[PDB]
């Protein structure tokens, strides 16, 4: 065994070490070929055919680039080949736990199908990784290339998910703290996973990525901060970091939360729920699981991919008729209709436990207009979306350490007013989308009136098209005019 | 209904007329989302996740651009909105007939599973189109937008497949002859399908496309040639046309016929053959079909996509054990091993009926070397690939009509020696690849010796690595040295 | 004469009407080949070799695209071929008035060399255009193609510079009001000049352009707003407009106001000032002009380009020794040294009349540190830069008209809180850069201390590297820590 | 001093060692900012504003990448930091000798102005480099970074120009032979200079570059070939090498030898010839040079750039009237007119000594057509262009060494028939362009007839538009029809 070269349209020629090749050439990894990076987004942006597999390659490559670059610039850090391999492996392997349609699965489906469980793709990635290592005799191959499985497997898992339980990490000591900032940066979110997806999703969506990760890597150094060694950015890159999260937010606004992409994810999720009793997936020892319980057995989860969409779509069992019908409406483009969007005002923040009650409230609003049809709670869908800079109300740049050219080893902080008065004052907001399940002309008109009345009742922002969709409702509200 | 916009990473914002949108939003069209443009290539180039669906959109868009451009430049042609829509529909619909993994299906699987039938994706596209139209009540919508179904459906079919039987076409008369050169150009192969796939495949593969279709469109005119009106290129674009086919050939060399991509296609094909008795696909009136017979019922063919790969992979039926095992070897990357490549010499041309006997000949060669193991016909795969400029021995530029700036209405011909002595002297060749099903170190070494000996016996070209893989064999052949 | 095609790396193949070709093929237009778009930026970003000439072609092309697109979508507007040509010509010709190194000339040099005059490149473009038309017998060619010079020349001039003096425009009536929003949009700054430079500058600088002008053009419509017909953007594009000005601001931050690019512009300006008495440029009737007075005669201005830099650099006249020395220091990279950057606080806004007194204040600060050398007012340069969204304190999106899909003919307004809480709260700010003319290690250290002390004295923001460059000064200020 | 970073739109962030920075920040290097890479091409492709400066940076960067890569993959080669710097310096400095408009200068002007001298830009680069080193005290800086000027300056000069006089090189011994194959590969022309210009010219011209140099670098190794250590390509890259020269040829066909670009270069050359008696350039010790003699003194040559075009254009001296007039015709686009293009037939090859007599032969042809005007030898220009794969008649791939994956240290050869029957049979050809200095309609018509008759008389290829431009002449020739 020697090194392999892969051509990636984002990164060009990526060299893979033979150990990485062995990890990649397993069912658990190859599975990622059959899970779309952006889920329902492909049904809006037809370039976004890409899957988690190629993204994982890119993340592993970039993890390698950053760690090599630091080591070249600063030999005093004592970064070993062993460290490099462990970081690359973590990079490759942090997407392993994703399920059908990526964020649809852990973001929409599991929460609705198994509300008692608490589950994340990060957790899944750890479990899948364990299963991958054990099912495929990787440990011998690791030690053949100088790894120490007890330490190193812990290190890898920790990079993906955080401390498995004061320095809280057991895979590496504090002098190598900076290594935990590469693959999944818990402190501020500036990590190579983002860098790959910005460039890859833009390339496929047909929009333009504003962020130069190569520049950033070139200006990255390790400096002591509070008795940890941390990655530090050159002071002047601070604008470019602000812009990085601006770009993240734009991609979410235009693509990842596109209103139609999300309603498709919702329809798919409904279909999965209706099929969950009847689909069976064979796991370990011939035991059988549902879509919703495949997460409890990694052998079954291995076989859970975008394929279930098509298994349902192509089924003939009458038990699956309901689920199949929903997916067929997706193909005919008979989708639930978008009514509008709004935001909460001032202090108001909407909690997860209230989400269930929001379609009720909308149906309860009492618009003063003549309506032929009357709509019920169940006719409305209300999607609440939390947009932030990755740390709820917090500014992640306040958690970044910088250095200046005249003292490269001295870490510093930079505040917002030290950069620009043109930056955002807040770093978290919520969007509320409302859709109607009844798609006819008269139902849609009514839904608009309930929606706008509801916005007025709750003192939300005026929908942009409020005066056009609901001309009789909007005048009642003073603030709107 | 009004027009829709789609964002494509190759073409940007594509406007779709409502009629085109109605055609697209059907199960027969949406099916294309689940068929990879490049089949097994995705397993070698991980950027090549793209499907036939986004390619079809691109082809329809480009068909519209070209026909608009001609009409703008030359109103005397009397191109109607009706003509435009019919050309766009043909452009969208010429990929409808592809099956699982695209060219794998009609190039490898169907020929092996049903040698008596003569089947092409083109034929399939016509049948699928008919099915699509009838299953979805499109005819009323066509006449709603000014189309005449009897004429226009014929026109569309003819564009895709040629005359359904002096002027052999019934969809349009000779004065509109040029329209048949847009979507699928039977005369020289210069059409918008190539243009989209060059650009789209390069974007995804991560290689660079040499061909400027926009330029070409801007210099295109219609001129009288032998009492037909034909599309003509400006004289000076002749070098760029030569280059267009050079590019086609390079893409085939590096990507579409990559030796590993092809062996994966072969392994998948094998698995499909072993599964063909046991997989059942439900067609019209609940009737049941095999993978190989789904092409006889369009309702079944609708449900025949890349999904069968995963149906086989994830199956538990012991009847499918053999098929499942082959696909599992693909995931482990336990592939049949490449032995080498060679070409025939001088006049020698290998016919399709001899393909079956080639693994026999290789096993029959008698290399003078000590061999621990001895290999049989069934241990060898021999892939023969015909590379040309799209017209076997012929130079497609001899079938192109040009015009010069001083007489824009006078069509002319340009010969090869009028352009360059640096062009190819031949326009067709064959490549022969040989692989071994026994993958161990000793089997592989033996296979190399049989291979090189066989090349010498048949007076083929010396493999590039001949002197390294078979140092004892290569000296016997004088021509090689 | 017929149409010409030009290949542009940004837009591809641009068709030019013969009239446009005639305008282009004049000394007054071709002059733009010898003026760098980004001036001193080329000395920091070596890909930025591009000149105003190619940018002007792009602007004219884009002006044509937008006006065609509107006309196609809305024939009721009665846009004529005549209207199209006039808009294209305005687009081509709005950069005619730029001088050596573009914004360096009107932004730095003329203000310093002739403070009594008020001069802008826009004014210059009008004068140059008149000169171009008259010197080259264009009027006959205009009427040959259906233009009416009295009306149309006024129209073109007005598009560039505004009303030459209630509907204030004479070139076209109110029913064609929208045409004045294409080339140079006085209302909100959303025009095709920006769209070309975003794309062209990015392509050359090696940074990525976030803005999709093609998308924007597709969603543009004309709607009645207060008895004017105005261009209107689709409501959902409002995020993308915000992002457009965000991008503008980033390009200014990283490129157009790069601290070194600006100091180079300053050094060049200094050299021009020292050479202004001795360089002579022959204008109309053999009369002679200086660099600073060439703006009074268009014949002379025609011959004023980046070439003067090299005329000075290569000169042997001892009268030019001082000017030549400054340029030579640019080649040796002996530049004035950057000391730091800071901003005013809260309400504080610095006016143009106080700029001259700022180097005085810096020298007057009294840092408590041991200094080997002592610096005077003349050793400091203080560059004050006003960054905004193009309308000082105003939000340009408040001056944009939108429309919704359910009422395409009804214009509406959208406020900031109707879009996002993550947008900027202010739309203008100031940056202050300080440089030192004495470049040695000890002078530089001193300058850092004066600078930081001065910042503290004026209650400005703490320089990002304050604690590294001036560790003894920064503790005195409470707010900083 | 520490390292600098430069952002290039082709290569991204390039790191420059301080020594390289010192070389770059000199008048002799910075001079390259004012010489256009493609000369008169900018007047056809307006994106081609790029200068030799940014190209040189790219070449130096790429030289560094290749040498680093070889050293990383094969430490046994003993490549030192010293070796790396010397290769980078050579890469930066191989363009130093170019003159105004690049190839126009040594290809057209010098040969005509000083036919007795034998001069190349390569020779110039060596002299400029010597001048650069001595004028700027670089030798001390070289030794400060571990270079040995006697050896290393020789090494650098040798890389650019070859042996300055059996191992013929003195800068390095045979064991470091491969280092001479990086910057200017005398054996086969595969070097980093091409790689930068392919990518940079394509980016600016707006055409697409087919060559992946990064791929090629990754597969490059050093192997023993005939007791030299040489750079070797992986066997399977052989198609990609063929393609590299195919691309070179296409770039020459469409861009570098564009017929109008070339005639502009000719017109500029003419103007330079007419100005050469009157322009004076001050060189070393106040001594004075002409445009044509500035190559004898590096101090004068330093000041010789594209600027002379504008010095002439803007001059008022009546002695320069003739020269100024020619340049003014360029601005009005009053160019010498292209008549047509043709090639010699079969064996016929045209020698340099016959070039001067070709306009005579054309004027002496006797076409049987009625002509109002009659043209003389001096009214014709005849440009003969030798197109090849860089080695006249020879196939440069026959001078490439390859290696196979099973024996990475064993170099091999690959012949053309081992690759493809679709490759070119010849590797050199000639193109003949003819232009007319009299531009009116009747002079042009006549010139077409002389041209086509002359082609017939010499048994050349039929111009592509022969039957349109000269319908009365073409029938006389049997071979044409
Ligand atoms: N850009 C580019 N990529 C290529 C080309 N040929 C192959 N690739 C891509 C496909 C894969 O992603 C990667 C590896 O392909 P190779 O043909 O280099 O490796 P393979 O393992 O088939 O051959 P080997 O094992 O080294 O004989 O590079 C090419 O000509 N250009
Ligand atoms: N380039 C780009 N494409 C976008 C953006 N937003 C959406 N798209 C893409 C997704 C689709 O392929 C296409 C159309 O999306 P739209 O959101 O304009 O259409 P949609 O039908 O959702 O809106 P509508 O039904 O007209 O309210 O444009 C954007 O900001 N930029
Ligand atoms: N992208 C591309 N651009 C080209 C090619 N050939 C020329 N160009 C560029 C140069 C110009 O910007 C534009 C027009 O060049 P042409 O060679 O088509 O025009 P020219 O006026 O020389 O030919 P003509 O008067 O029509 O015989 O296209 C080509 O093969 N590819
Ligand atoms: N891609 C990119 N390039 C930039 C940016 N800012 C500057 N550049 C370019 C211009 C130069 O070619 C190169 C280095 O410029 P920098 O401003 O980083 O260095 P400078 O020497 O002015 O800063 P320093 O001396 O380190 O304070 O990068 C940016 O935000 N993004």
Residues of chain D in contact with residue A7, where contact means CB-CB under 8 angstroms, are: 215
With an 8 Å Cβ cutoff, are B209 and D208 in contact? yes
Rounded Cα gap, residues A28 and A34, in angstroms: 11
Residue B326 makes CB contacts below 8 A (sequence gap 6+) with B267, B268, B270, B271, B274
Per-residue b/e over D100-129, b at no fewer than 16 CB within 10 Å? Answer: bbbbbbbebbbbebbeeeebebbebbbbbb
Rounded Cα gap, residues B374 and B365, in angstroms: 11
Rounded Cα gap, residues B378 and C25, in angstroms: 72
Residues of chain C in contact with residue B214, where contact means CB-CB under 8 angstroms, are: 12-13
Residue D36 makes CB contacts below 8 A (sequence gap 6+) with D42, D48, D49, D50, D51, D52, D101, D102, D306
**The pair of three-digit structure tokens given for residue A351, joined into one six-digit string:** 């909690």
Instruction: For residue C445, give the DSSP letter.
Output: H
The pair phi, psi for residue D413, each rounded to 5°, is: -115, 155
With an 8 Å Cβ cutoff, are B9 and A328 in contact? no
Rounded Cα gap, residues C364 and C355, in angstroms: 15
Instruction: For residue D73, give the DSSP letter.
Output: H
Q: Hey, where are the domains in chain B? A: 1-334, 335-481
Name the closest-CA residue to atom 28, ligand 2: B7
With an 8 Å Cβ cutoff, are D45 and C12 in contact? no
D5–chain A Cβ distance below 8 A for any pair? yes
* D406 Cβ inside 6 Å of ligand 1: no
Q: How large is the C-alpha radius of gyration of chain B?
A: 25
With an 8 Å Cβ cutoff, are B311 and A311 in contact? yes
Rounded Cα gap, residues A149 and A378, in angstroms: 53
Q: CB–CB of B45/B206 below 8 Å?
A: yes
Mutate to test the pocket of ligand 2, among C208, C210, C211, C212 (most ligand atoms within 8 A of CB): C212
B402–chain D Cβ distance below 8 A for any pair? yes
* D21 Cβ inside 6 Å of ligand 4: no
Closest CA to A109 of A294, A307, A269: A269
With an 8 Å Cβ cutoff, are A303 and B282 in contact? no
Rounded Cα gap, residues B132 and A228, in angstroms: 65
Q: CB–CB of A156/A129 below 8 Å?
A: yes
Instruction: For residue C444, give the DSSP letter.
Output: H
DSSP characters over D207-261: ------HHHHHHTEEEEEETTEEEEEEEGGGHHHHHHHHHHHHHHIIIIIT-HHH
Helix and strand numbers (H, E) in chain D are 19, 11
Q: CB–CB of A393/A427 below 8 Å?
A: yes
Q: What distance in angstroms lies between residue B6's CA and the mean position of ligand 2's atoms? A: 7
B296–chain D Cβ distance below 8 A for any pair? no
**The pair of three-digit structure tokens given for residue C212, joined into one six-digit string:** 């999709």
**The pair of three-digit structure tokens given for residue D429, joined into one six-digit string:** 């050809």
D392 φψ region: left (φ > 0), alpha (ψ -120 to 50), beta (else):
left
Nearest residue in C to A389, CA atom: C422
Rounded Cα gap, residues B24 and B162, in angstroms: 23
Residues of chain B in contact with residue A10, where contact means CB-CB under 8 angstroms, are: 47, 206
* C44 Cβ inside 6 Å of ligand 4: yes
Q: Is D475 exposed, middle or buried (0-12, 13-18, 19+ CB in 10 A)?
A: exposed
Pick the atom of ligand 3 nearest to D207's CA: 1
Catalytic residue among C55, C121, C131, C204: C121
The pair phi, psi for residue A409, each rounded to 5°, is: -100, -5
Residue A113 makes CB contacts below 8 A (sequence gap 6+) with A272, A273, A276, A291, A292
Q: CB–CB of A45/A110 below 8 Å?
A: no
Rounded Cα gap, residues C388 and C365, in angstroms: 30
Q: How many residues are there in chain B? A: 481
B131 classed as catalytic: no
**The pair of three-digit structure tokens given for residue B248, joined into one six-digit string:** 């086609």
Q: What distance in angstroms lies between residue B98's CA and the mean position of ligand 1's atoms? A: 26
Angle between helices A81-93 and A52-73 (to 10 degrees): 160
Residues of chain B in contact with residue C15, where contact means CB-CB under 8 angstroms, are: 218
Rounded Cα gap, residues D119 and D102, in angstroms: 13
Instruction: For residue D382, give the DSSP letter.
Output: E
* A405 Cβ inside 6 Å of ligand 4: yes
Q: CB–CB of B87/B64 below 8 Å?
A: yes
Residue C462 makes CB contacts below 8 A (sequence gap 6+) with A418, C342, C455, C474, C477, C479, C480
Q: CB–CB of A109/A308 below 8 Å?
A: no
Q: H/E element holding C215?
A: helix C213-218
* A403 Cβ inside 6 Å of ligand 2: no
D397 φψ region: left (φ > 0), alpha (ψ -120 to 50), beta (else):
alpha
Rounded Cα gap, residues C202 and C35, in angstroms: 18
Q: What distance in angstroms lies between residue A7's CA and the mean position of ligand 1's atoms? A: 7
Catalytic residue among B55, B98, B121, B131: B121
* D260 Cβ inside 6 Å of ligand 3: yes
Catalytic residue among A121, A131, A204, A258: A121
Residues of chain D in contact with residue A5, where contact means CB-CB under 8 angstroms, are: 218
With an 8 Å Cβ cutoff, are A49 and B51 in contact? yes
With an 8 Å Cβ cutoff, are B468 and D406 in contact? yes
Count of beta carbons in the 10 Å neighbourhood of residue D372: 9
Cite the DSSP H helix spans in D74-168.
81-93, 103-104, 110-113, 121-135, 138-144, 149-161
Specify the CATH class of A1-334 in words.
mainly alpha
DSSP characters over D248-307: HHHHIIIIIT-HHHHHHHHHHHHHHHHHTTT--EE-GGG-EE-TTTGGG-HHHHTT-STH
Closest CA to C14 of C1, C25, C4: C4
Closest CA to D437 of D339, D320, D351: D339
Rounded Cα gap, residues B42 and B100, in angstroms: 13
Instruction: For residue C290, give the DSSP letter.
Output: -
With an 8 Å Cβ cutoff, are A210 and C211 in contact? no
Residue A293 makes CB contacts below 8 A (sequence gap 6+) with A114, A300
Rounded Cα gap, residues A466 and D191, in angstroms: 64
Rounded Cα gap, residues A367 and A477, in angstroms: 12
Instruction: For residue D409, give the DSSP letter.
Output: E
Name the closest-CA residue to atom 17, ligand 3: D258
- Give the pairing of strands A228-234 and A402-404: parallel
* C335 Cβ inside 6 Å of ligand 4: no
* A212 Cβ inside 6 Å of ligand 4: yes
* A45 Cβ inside 6 Å of ligand 2: yes
Instruction: For residue D36, give the DSSP letter.
Output: B
Q: What distance in angstroms lies between residue C266's CA and the mean position of ligand 4's atoms? A: 19
Closest CA to D391 of D212, D240, D186: D186
**The pair of three-digit structure tokens given for residue D120, joined into one six-digit string:** 């190349």
Q: Is A227 exposed, middle or buried (0-12, 13-18, 19+ CB in 10 A)?
A: exposed
A370–chain D Cβ distance below 8 A for any pair? no
Residue A452 makes CB contacts below 8 A (sequence gap 6+) with A340, A367, A463, A466, A469, A470, A473, A474
D214–chain A Cβ distance below 8 A for any pair? yes
Q: H/E element holding D467?
A: helix D466-469
Rounded Cα gap, residues D378 and D438, in angstroms: 10
CA distance B178 to chain C (A): 24
Rounded Cα gap, residues D369 and D380, in angstroms: 19
* Experimental technique behind these coordinates: X-ray
Rounded Cα gap, residues D423 and D211, in angstroms: 17
The residue behind tokens 């958690």 is A399
Q: Which C-chain residues 37-96 have CB contacts (< 8 A) with chain D?
A: 42, 45-47, 49-51, 53-54, 57
Q: Is D353 exposed, middle or buried (0-12, 13-18, 19+ CB in 10 A)?
A: exposed
Resolution in Å, one decimal, please: 2.3
**The pair of three-digit structure tokens given for residue C309, joined into one six-digit string:** 């830099």
**The pair of three-digit structure tokens given for residue C109, joined into one six-digit string:** 């040099």
To test the contact with chain D by mutation, choose from C206, C264, C279, C306 the residue with the greatest count of D C-beta atoms within 10 A, namely C206
CA distance C379 to chain A (A): 22
- Give the pairing of strands B4-8 and A380-388: unpaired
Nearest residue in C to D302, CA atom: C314
Closest CA to C156 of C67, C86, C83, C61: C86
The residue behind tokens 């798609």 is A439
State chain B's maximal CA–CA distance in angstroms.
Answer: 77
CA distance A7 to chain B (A): 6
* A254 Cβ inside 6 Å of ligand 2: yes
Angle between helices A52-73 and A192-205 (to 10 degrees): 130
- Give the per-residue SS3 of chain A: CCCEEEEECCCEEEEECHHHHHHHCCHHHHHHHHCECCHHHHHCCCCCCCEHHHHHHHHHHHHHHHHHHHHHHCHHHCCCHHHHHHHHHHHHHCCCCCCCCCHHHHHHHHHHHCCCCCCCHHHHHHHHHHHHHHHCCHHHHHHHCCCCHHHHHHHHHHHHHCCCCCCCCCCCCHHHHHHHHCCCCCCCCCCHHHHHHHHHHHHHHCCCCCCCHHHHHHCEEEEEECCEEEEEEEHHHHHHHHHHHHHHHHHHHHHHCCHHHHHHHHHHHHHHHHHCCCCCEECHHHCEECCCCHHHCHHHHCCCCCHHHHHHHCCCCHHHHHHHHHHHHHHCCCCCEEEEEECCCCCCCCCHHHHHHHHHHHHHCCCCCCCCCCCCHHHEEEEEEEEECCCCCCCHHHHCCEEECCEEEEEECCCCCCCCCCCECCCEEEEEEEEECCCCHHHHHHHHHHHHHHHHHCCCCCCCCHHHHCCCCHHHCCCCC
CA distance D426 to chain B (A): 6
Q: What distance in angstroms lies between residue D380's CA and the mean position of ligand 1's atoms? A: 52
CA-angle at C334, arms to C329 and C335, nearest 5°? 100
The pair phi, psi for residue D81, each rounded to 5°, is: -50, -35
Residue D177 makes CB contacts below 8 A (sequence gap 6+) with D228, D229, D230
Residues of chain C in contact with residue B7, where contact means CB-CB under 8 angstroms, are: 215
Q: What distance in angstroms lies between residue A197's CA and the mean position of ligand 4's atoms? A: 24
Rounded Cα gap, residues B59 and B164, in angstroms: 22
What stretches of C313-363 adopt beta strand conformation (E)? 337-342
Rounded Cα gap, residues A475 and A155, in angstroms: 61
Q: H/E element holding D310?
A: helix D307-313
Q: What distance in angstroms lies between residue A107's CA and the mean position of ligand 3's atoms? A: 53
Instruction: For residue C254, give the DSSP letter.
Output: I
The alpha carbon of residue C59 and the mean position of all alpha carbons in its chain are separated, in whole angstroms, by: 14
Rounded Cα gap, residues C438 and C259, in angstroms: 17
Residues of chain A in contact with residue B42, where contact means CB-CB under 8 angstroms, are: 33
Q: CB–CB of A216/A233 below 8 Å?
A: yes
Q: What distance in angstroms lies between residue D303's CA and the mean position of ligand 4's atoms? A: 29
SS3 category, D13: strand
The pair phi, psi for residue D96, each rounded to 5°, is: -60, -30
Closest CA to C35 of C89, C88, C104: C104
Per-residue b/e over A406-417, b at no fewer than 16 CB within 10 Å? Answer: eebebbbebebe
The pair phi, psi for residue C363, each rounded to 5°, is: -60, -25
Rounded Cα gap, residues B430 and B344, in angstroms: 7
Rounded Cα gap, residues A180 and A108, in angstroms: 29
Q: CB–CB of C121/C106 below 8 Å?
A: yes
- Give the per-residue SS3 of chain B: CCCEEEEECCCEEEEECHHHHHHHCCHHHHHHHHCECCHHHHHCCCCCCCEHHHHHHHHHHHHHHHHHHHHHHCHHHCCCHHHHHHHHHHHHHCCCCCCCCCHHHHHHHHHHHCCCCCCCHHHHHHHHHHHHHHHCCHHHHHHHCCCCHHHHHHHHHHHHHCCCCCCCCCCCCHHHHHHHHCCCCCCCCCCHHHHHHHHHHHHHHCCCCCCCHHHHHHCEEEEEECCEEEEEEEHHHHHHHHHHHHHHHHHHHHHHCCHHHHHHHHHHHHHHHHHCCCCCEECHHHCEECCCCHHHCHHHHCCCCCHHHHHHHCCCCHHHHHHHHHHHHHHCCCCCEEEEEECCCCCCCCCHHHHHHHHHHHHHCCCCCCCCCCCCHHHEEEEEEEEECCCCCCCHHHHCCEEECCEEEEEECCCCCCCCCCCECCCEEEEEEEEECCCCHHHHHHHHHHHHHHHHHHCCCCCCCHHHHCCCCHHHCCCCC
Residues of chain A in contact with residue C470, where contact means CB-CB under 8 angstroms, are: none
């Amino acid at each position: 065994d020697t090194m392999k070269v892969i051509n990636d349209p984002i990164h060009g020629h990526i060299e893979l070490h033979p150990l990485l090749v062995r990890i990649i050439d397993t069912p658990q990894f190859q599975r990622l070929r059959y899970i779309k990076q952006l889920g329902g987004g492909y049904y809006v942006f037809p370039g976004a055919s890409h899957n988690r597999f190629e993204h994982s390659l890119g993340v592993g490559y970039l993890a390698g680039c950053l760690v090599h670059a630091l080591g070249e610039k600063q030999p005093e850090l004592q970064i070993s080949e062993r460290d490099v391999l462990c970081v690359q492996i973590a990079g490759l392997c942090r997407n392993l736990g994703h399920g059908p349609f990526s964020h649809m699965f852990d973001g929409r489906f599991i929460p609705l199908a198994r509300p008692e469980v608490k589950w994340t793709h990060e957790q899944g990635s750890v479990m899948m990784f364990e299963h991958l290592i054990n099912s495929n005799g990787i440990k011998p191959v690791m030690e053949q290339y100088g790894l120490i499985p007890e330490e190193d497997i812990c290190f890898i898992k920790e990079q993906i998910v955080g401390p498995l339980e004061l320095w809280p990490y057991k895979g590496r000591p504090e002098n190598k703290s900076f290594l935990y900032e590469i693959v999944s940066n818990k402190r501020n979110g500036i990590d190579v996973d983002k860098w790959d997806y910005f460039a890859r999703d833009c390339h496929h969506l047909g929009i333009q990525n504003n962020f130069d990760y190569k520049r950033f890597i070139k200006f990255a150094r390790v400096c002591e901060v509070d008795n940890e060694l941390r990655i530090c950015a050159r002071d002047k890159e601070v604008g470019n970091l602000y812009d990085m999260f601006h770009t993240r937010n734009s991609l979410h606004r235009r693509a990842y939360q596109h209103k139609v992409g999300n309603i498709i994810d919702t329809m798919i999720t409904d279909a999965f729920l209706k099929a969950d009793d009847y689909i069976e997936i064979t796991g370990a020892g011939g035991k059988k699981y549902r879509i919703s319980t495949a997460i409890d057995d990694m052998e079954a989860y291995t076989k859970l991919t975008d394929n279930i969409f098509l298994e349902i779509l192509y089924s003939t069992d009458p038990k699956l008729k309901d689920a199949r019908e929903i997916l067929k409406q997706i193909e005919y483009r008979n989708l639930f209709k978008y009514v509008g969007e709004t935001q909460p005002t001032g202090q108001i923040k909407i909690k997860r436990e209230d989400y269930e009650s929001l379609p009720k409230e909308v149906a309860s609003a009492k618009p003063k207009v003549l309506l032929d049809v009357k709509l019920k709670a169940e006719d409305f869908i209300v999607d609440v979306i939390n947009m932030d800079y990755g740390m709820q109300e917090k500014n992640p740049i306040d958690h970044v350490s910088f250095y200046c050219k005249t003292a490269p080893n001295r870490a510093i902080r930079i505040t917002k007013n030290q950069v620009s008065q043109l930056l955002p004052e807040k770093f978290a907001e919520q969007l509320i989308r409302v859709y109607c399940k009844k798609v006819d002309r008269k139902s849609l008109y009514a839904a608009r009136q309930y929606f706008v009345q509801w916005c007025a009742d709750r003192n939300f922002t005026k929908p942009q098209d409020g005066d056009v969709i609901a001309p009789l409702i909007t005048p009642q509200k003073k603030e709107w005019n």
